[PDB]
Amino acid sequence: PESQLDLRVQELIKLICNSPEHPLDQHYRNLHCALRPLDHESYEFKVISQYLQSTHAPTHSDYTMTLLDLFEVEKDGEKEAFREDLHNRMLLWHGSRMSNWVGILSHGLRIAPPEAPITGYMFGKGIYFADMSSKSANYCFASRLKNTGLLLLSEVALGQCNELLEANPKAEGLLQGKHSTKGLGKMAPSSAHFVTLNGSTVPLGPASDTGILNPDGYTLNYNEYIVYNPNQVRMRYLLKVQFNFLQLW
Amino acid sequence: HHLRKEVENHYKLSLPEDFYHFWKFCEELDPEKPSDSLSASLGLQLVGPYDILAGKHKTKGLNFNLHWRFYYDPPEFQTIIIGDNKTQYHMGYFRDSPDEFPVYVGINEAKKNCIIVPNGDNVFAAVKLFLTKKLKEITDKKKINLLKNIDEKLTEAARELGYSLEQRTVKMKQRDKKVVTKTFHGAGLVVPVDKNDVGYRELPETDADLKRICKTIVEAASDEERLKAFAPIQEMMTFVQFANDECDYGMGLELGMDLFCYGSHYFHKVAGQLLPLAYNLLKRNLFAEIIEEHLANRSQENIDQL
Numbered sequence: 001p002e003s004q005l006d007l008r009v010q011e012l013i014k015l016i017c018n019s020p021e022h023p024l025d026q027h028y029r030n031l032h033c034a035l036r037p038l039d040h041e042s043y044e045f046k047v048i049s050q051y052l053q054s055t056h057a058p059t060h061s062d063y064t065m066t067l068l069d070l071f072e073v074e075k076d077g078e079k080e081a082f083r084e085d086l087h088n089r090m091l092l093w094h095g096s097r098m099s100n101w102v103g104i105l106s107h108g109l110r111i112a113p114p115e116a117p118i119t120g121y122m123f124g125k126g127i128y129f130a131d132m133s134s135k136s137a138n139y140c141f142a143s144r145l146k147n148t149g150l151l152l153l154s155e156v157a158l159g160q161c162n163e164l165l166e167a168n169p170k171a172e173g174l175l176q177g178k179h180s181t182k183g184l185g186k187m188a189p190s191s192a193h194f195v196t197l198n199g200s201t202v203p204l205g206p207a208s209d210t211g212i213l214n215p216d217g218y219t220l221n222y223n224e225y226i227v228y229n230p231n232q233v234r235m236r237y238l239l240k241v242q243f244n245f246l247q248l249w
Numbered sequence: 250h251h252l253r254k255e256v257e258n259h260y261k262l263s264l265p266e267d268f269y270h271f272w273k274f275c276e277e278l279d280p281e282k283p284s285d286s287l288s289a290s291l292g293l294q295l296v297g298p299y300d301i302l303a304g305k306h307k308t309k310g311l312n313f314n315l316h317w318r319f320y321y322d323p324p325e326f327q328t329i330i331i332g333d334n335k336t337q338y339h340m341g342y343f344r345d346s347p348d349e350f351p352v353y354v355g356i357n358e359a360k361k362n363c364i365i366v367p368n369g370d371n372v373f374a375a376v377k378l379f380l381t382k383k384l385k386e387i388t389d390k391k392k393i394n395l396l397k398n399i400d401e402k403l404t405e406a407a408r409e410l411g412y413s414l415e416q417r418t419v420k421m422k423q424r425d426k427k428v429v430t431k432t433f434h435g436a437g438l439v440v441p442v443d444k445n446d447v448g449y450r451e452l453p454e455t456d457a458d459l460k461r462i463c464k465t466i467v468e469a470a471s472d473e474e475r476l477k478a479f480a481p482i483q484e485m486m487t488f489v490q491f492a493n494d495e496c497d498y499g500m501g502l503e504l505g506m507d508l509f510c511y512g513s514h515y516f517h518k519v520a521g522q523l524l525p526l527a528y529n530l531l532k533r534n535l536f537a538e539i540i541e542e543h544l545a546n547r548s549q550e551n552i553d554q555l
């Protein structure tokens with residue numbers, strides 16, 4: 001009964017969880033997901049760390065983020081299922097509750113559940129991504145007590161984007177052959193600062209004005225990216241992040 | 250018109266025409282000391298921007314965003330008149346935006362609660378309504394007679410300027426149609442809403458459920474217990490971030506406003522993260538300034554002239 005995994009992956013499993021194989025060794029083999037830690041000195045960490053800080057959104061001032069540990073993610077089968085034909089391959093942010101990462105790592109990203117939309121989803125039942133690290137980071141629901149969260153970096157086959165200025169629950173019907181919806185925001189990383197990591201575009205910051213205005217009212221502050229098929233997504237990195245908040249009271 | 254600008258430059262707000270006309274009315278009651286002209290009869294004193302008009306400001310650090318700003322005065326509320334100091338009753342102009350004229354005159358008793366009650370749409374109406382109410386308790390013939398005489402001048406003066414004396418006017422019933430939520434103080438939030446309902450969304454808790462959450466925080470028996478009790482507020486603050494990203498700026502304004510109104514110092518920090526941000530996104534930069542300075546300096550004694 002003794003574990004065979006690296007301590008940093010060991011620490012991750014303890015975080016998302018709770019024989020001749022240790023239970024920590026046992027749960028990972030049941031994720032069916034490679035998670036290989038990267039070195040704090042590595043090119044991949046220096047580049048990904050810079051992505052995280054330069055895309056902390058100006059309106060998300062109640063905290064800052066420190067990157068504790070970085071992991072490389074290769075989900076088996078996801079590489080083959082991947083729409084390699086499609087253009088606009090970007091490395092994009094996805095944040096979620098701690099309680100969701102076993103589900104996310106075991107089964108890949110799923111579309112918005114076919115259950116209760118409530119009123120509906122902002123752009124219908126798809127998978128959501130952001131280009132501002134802190135826009136995605138706010139979806140981890142970290143708190144002063146639970147101040148560790150995860151960010152997912154994924155290659156996203158955007159293909160041809162259906163660009164939208166305002167919200168639309170029926171956005172998926174309007175695709176008519178294009179491959180994803182992009183909600184245009186006042187602010188986003190601009191291509192002048194883009195960089196490449198292992199064959200995927202990295203929308204590096206700082207954010208700038210995008211020149212987008214809704215002539216019919218409110219213009220969203222930041223982009224959102226939505227794909228409606230899990231085969232347009234391929235996880236590549238998983239960030240272990242500590243959220244550093246301000247004075248509570 | 251020339252003495253208009255000395256008042257408004259100091260406060261960084263425009264004041265309505267009834268503010269200045271009422272000074273001339275009170276000047277007429279007492280040319281020597283116009284502000285206390287209603288003090289003996291009604292227990293009211295003109296203050297706030299009227300202190301500048303009274304020349305009381307030339308004695309003097311002097312911050313007019315706090316001057317006669319009572320403990321529960323949201324940035325919309327600019328005190329102009331004080332009454333009973335036992336209930337700490339006072340009146341103020343209420344503006345939904347620093348770029349608009351006041352929408353009506355409100356009253357609060359800061360020693361009693363945080364609720365702002367509409368009290369006419371001009372300073373003439375607000376005092377007349379108070380006078381009518383004060384006469385019901387008075388049993389002394391000379392005070393009754395004095396108030397009866399003054400009432401005729403206000404009514405005639407209001408008639409002469411074309412000012413309504415109703416507690417709720419037409420613009421007030423029209424503004425109430427634009428109110429996207431009342432908040433704990435009942436005076437309402439007005440935010441821009443475009444053709445897709447963008448600008449406001451409701452809180453995940455009823456007002457009663459929010460008040461209940463706050464009580465468990467303030468009555469927590471240790472800091473370890475308070476931190477745990479904060480979890481529903483922290484949860485709600487993450488949703489406000491989502492609303493902000495999608496231009497529903499009014500949600501964080503309502504949450505921040507309700508926490509300020511509850512009045513506990515345990516909420517000064519979170520309200521300081523919500524309200525400046527909310528006012529800035531709405532292009533109400535001055536109200537963001539007021540609320541920072543008030544949260545940094547929110548006192549129960551507040552005439553910066555002592």
Ligand SMILES: Nc1ncnc2c1ncn2[C@@H]1O[C@H](C(=O)N2CCN(CC(=O)Nc3cccc4c3CNC4=O)CC2)[C@@H](O)[C@H]1O
Nearest residue numbers: 093094095096100103104107109110112128129130136139
């Ligand atoms: N197998 C799966 N296992 C566990 N969780 C899964 C999963 N598939 C989807 N999810 C998780 O459930 C949730 C889900 O579908 N939802 C809830 C969120 N909602 C809106 C939405 O996604 N907004 C949105 C918009 C922009 C960026 C980001 C998000 C969320 N995270 C981000 O970085 C859409 C429907 C989602 O938060 C996701 O993380």
